[PDB]
PDB file of C-alpha atoms in Angstrom:
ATOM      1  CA  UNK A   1      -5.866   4.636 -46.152  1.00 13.09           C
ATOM      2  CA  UNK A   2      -3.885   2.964 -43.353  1.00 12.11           C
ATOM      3  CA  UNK A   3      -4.584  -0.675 -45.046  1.00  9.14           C
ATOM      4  CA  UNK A   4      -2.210   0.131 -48.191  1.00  8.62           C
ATOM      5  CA  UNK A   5       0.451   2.252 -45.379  1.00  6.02           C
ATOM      6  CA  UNK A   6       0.508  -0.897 -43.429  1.00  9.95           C
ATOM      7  CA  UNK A   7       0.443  -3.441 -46.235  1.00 11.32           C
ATOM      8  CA  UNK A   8       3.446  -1.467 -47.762  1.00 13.39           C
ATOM      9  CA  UNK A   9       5.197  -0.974 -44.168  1.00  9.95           C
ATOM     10  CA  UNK A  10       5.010  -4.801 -43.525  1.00  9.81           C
ATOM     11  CA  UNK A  11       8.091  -7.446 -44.458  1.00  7.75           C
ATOM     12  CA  UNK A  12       5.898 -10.520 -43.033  1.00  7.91           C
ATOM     13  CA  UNK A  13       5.948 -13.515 -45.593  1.00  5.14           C
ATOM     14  CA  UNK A  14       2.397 -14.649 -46.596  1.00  3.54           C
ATOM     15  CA  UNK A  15       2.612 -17.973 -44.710  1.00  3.39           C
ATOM     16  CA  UNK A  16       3.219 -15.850 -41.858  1.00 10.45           C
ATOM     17  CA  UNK A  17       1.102 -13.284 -41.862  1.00 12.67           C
ATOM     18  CA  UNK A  18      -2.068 -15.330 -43.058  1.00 14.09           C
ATOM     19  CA  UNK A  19      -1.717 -16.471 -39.221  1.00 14.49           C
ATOM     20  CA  UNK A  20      -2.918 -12.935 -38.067  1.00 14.08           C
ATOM     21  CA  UNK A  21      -5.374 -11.875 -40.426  1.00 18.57           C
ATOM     22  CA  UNK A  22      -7.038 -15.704 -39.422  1.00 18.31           C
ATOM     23  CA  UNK A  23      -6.876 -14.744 -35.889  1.00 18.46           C
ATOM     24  CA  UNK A  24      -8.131 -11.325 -35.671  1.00 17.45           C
ATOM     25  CA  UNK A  25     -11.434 -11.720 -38.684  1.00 17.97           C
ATOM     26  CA  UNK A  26     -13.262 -13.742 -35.524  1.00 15.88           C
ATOM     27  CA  UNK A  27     -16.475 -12.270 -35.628  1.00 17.05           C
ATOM     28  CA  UNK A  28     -16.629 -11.011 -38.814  1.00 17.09           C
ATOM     29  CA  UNK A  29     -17.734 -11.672 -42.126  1.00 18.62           C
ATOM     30  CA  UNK A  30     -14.691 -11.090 -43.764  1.00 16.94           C
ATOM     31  CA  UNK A  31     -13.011 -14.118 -46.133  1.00 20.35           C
ATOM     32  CA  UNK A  32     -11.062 -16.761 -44.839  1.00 23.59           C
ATOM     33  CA  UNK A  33      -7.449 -17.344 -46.110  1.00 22.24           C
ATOM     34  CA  UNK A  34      -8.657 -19.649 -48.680  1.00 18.36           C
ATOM     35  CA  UNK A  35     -11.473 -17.829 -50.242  1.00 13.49           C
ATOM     36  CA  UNK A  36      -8.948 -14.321 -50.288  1.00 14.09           C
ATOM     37  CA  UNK A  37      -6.311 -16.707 -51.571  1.00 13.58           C
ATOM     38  CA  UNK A  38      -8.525 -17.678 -54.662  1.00 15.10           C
ATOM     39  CA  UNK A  39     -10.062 -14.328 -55.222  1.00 14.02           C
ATOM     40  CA  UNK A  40      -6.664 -12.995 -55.516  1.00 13.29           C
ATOM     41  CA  UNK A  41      -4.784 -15.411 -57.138  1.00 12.51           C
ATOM     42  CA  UNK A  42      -7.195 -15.248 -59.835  1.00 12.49           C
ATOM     43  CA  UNK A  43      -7.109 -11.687 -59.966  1.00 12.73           C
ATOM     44  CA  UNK A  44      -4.013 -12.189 -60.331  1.00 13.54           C
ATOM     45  CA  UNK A  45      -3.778 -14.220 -63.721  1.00 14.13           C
ATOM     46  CA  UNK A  46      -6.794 -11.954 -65.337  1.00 17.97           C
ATOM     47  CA  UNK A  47      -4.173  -9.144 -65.373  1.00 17.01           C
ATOM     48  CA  UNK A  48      -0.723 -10.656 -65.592  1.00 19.51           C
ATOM     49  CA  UNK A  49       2.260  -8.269 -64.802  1.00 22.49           C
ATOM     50  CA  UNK A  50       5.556  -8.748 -62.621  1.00 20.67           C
ATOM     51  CA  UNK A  51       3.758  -6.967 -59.181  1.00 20.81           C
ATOM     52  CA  UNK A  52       4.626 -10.446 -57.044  1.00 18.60           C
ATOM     53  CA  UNK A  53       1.463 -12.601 -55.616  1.00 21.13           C
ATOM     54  CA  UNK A  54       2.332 -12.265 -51.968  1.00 20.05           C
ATOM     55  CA  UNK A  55       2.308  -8.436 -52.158  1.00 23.21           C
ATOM     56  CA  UNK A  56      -1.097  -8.813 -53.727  1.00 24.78           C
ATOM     57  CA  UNK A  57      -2.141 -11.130 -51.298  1.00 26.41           C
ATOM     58  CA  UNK A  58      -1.007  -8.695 -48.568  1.00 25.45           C
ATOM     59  CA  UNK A  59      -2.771  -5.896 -49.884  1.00 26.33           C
ATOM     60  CA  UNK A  60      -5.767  -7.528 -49.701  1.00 28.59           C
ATOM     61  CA  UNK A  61      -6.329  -8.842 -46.573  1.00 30.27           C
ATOM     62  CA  UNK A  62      -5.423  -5.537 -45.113  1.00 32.87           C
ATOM     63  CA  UNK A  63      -8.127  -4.145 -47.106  1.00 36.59           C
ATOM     64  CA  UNK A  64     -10.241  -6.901 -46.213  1.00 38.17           C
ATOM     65  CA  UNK A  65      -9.512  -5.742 -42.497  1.00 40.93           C
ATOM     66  CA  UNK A  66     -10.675  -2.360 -43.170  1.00 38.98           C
ATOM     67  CA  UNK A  67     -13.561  -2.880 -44.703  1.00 41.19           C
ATOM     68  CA  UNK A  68     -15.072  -5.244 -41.885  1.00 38.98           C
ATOM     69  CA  UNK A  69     -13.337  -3.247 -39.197  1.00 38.99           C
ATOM     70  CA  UNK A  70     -10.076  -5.142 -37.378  1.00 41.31           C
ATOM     71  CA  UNK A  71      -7.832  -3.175 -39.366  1.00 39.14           C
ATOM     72  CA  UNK A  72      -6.276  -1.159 -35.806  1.00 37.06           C
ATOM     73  CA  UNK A  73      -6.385  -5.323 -34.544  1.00 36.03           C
ATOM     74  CA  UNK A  74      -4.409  -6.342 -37.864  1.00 35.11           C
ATOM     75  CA  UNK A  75      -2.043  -3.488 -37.373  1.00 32.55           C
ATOM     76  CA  UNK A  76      -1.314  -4.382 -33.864  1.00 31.26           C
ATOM     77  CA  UNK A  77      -0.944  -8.318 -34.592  1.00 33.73           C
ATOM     78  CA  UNK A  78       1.502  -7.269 -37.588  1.00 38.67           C
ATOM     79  CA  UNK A  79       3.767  -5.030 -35.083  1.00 35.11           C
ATOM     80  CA  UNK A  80       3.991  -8.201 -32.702  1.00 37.92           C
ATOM     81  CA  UNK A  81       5.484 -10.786 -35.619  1.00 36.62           C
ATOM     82  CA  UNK A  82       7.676  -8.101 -36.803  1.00 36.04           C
ATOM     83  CA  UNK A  83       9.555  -7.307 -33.391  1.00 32.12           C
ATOM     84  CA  UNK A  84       9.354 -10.938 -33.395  1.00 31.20           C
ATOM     85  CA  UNK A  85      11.639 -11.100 -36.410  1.00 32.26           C
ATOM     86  CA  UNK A  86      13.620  -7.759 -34.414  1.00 34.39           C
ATOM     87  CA  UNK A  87      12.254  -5.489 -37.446  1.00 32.63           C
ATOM     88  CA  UNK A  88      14.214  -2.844 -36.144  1.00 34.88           C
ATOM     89  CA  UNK A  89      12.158   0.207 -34.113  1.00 35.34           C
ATOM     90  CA  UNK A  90      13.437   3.159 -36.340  1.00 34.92           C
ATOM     91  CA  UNK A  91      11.072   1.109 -38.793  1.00 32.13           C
ATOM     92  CA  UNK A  92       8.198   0.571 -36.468  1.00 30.11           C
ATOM     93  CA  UNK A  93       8.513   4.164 -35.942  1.00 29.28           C
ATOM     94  CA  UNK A  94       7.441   4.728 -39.657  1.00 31.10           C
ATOM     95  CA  UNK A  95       4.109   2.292 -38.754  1.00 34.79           C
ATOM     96  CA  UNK A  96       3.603   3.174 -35.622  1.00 34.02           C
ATOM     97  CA  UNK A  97       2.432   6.644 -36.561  1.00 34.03           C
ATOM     98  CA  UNK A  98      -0.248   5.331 -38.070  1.00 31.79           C
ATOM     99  CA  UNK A  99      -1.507   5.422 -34.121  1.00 31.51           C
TER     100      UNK A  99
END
């Protein structure tokens, strides 16, 4: 779906891109950035390989998005911090078809 697109378009750090996710689960039941950050991180160390934390981490928030429904929200938020950091548009291009 468009959560693994946009979790594999994005260069956002963790630390940085918990920030969104926070902001745009208002209203939802979906897990806060500690509760992902333990479910993960121990998901993590049940299966041990060399795929890095923060791109599991990243993977699933944007699935948590999608499943409670602020994925389009996410995907917007993500866009902003990027330009932010002048992610250059011929790149956005690739994520912004996703619209």
């Amino acid at each position: 779906s468009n959560a693994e697109r946009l979790a594999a378009w994005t260069r956002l750090p963790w630390e940085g891109l918990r920030y969104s996710y926070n902001r745009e689960r208002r209203g939802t039941a979906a897990r806060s950035c500690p509760q992902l950050e333990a479910d993960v991180a121990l998901k993590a160390e049940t299966q041990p390989s060399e795929i890095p934390l923060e791109r599991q981490l990243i993977l699933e928030a944007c699935r948590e998005a999608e499943r409670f429904g602020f994925l389009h929200e996410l995907s917007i938020a993500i866009v902003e911090m990027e330009r932010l950091n002048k992610r250059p548009e011929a790149e956005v291009e690739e994520i912004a078809k996703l619209w």
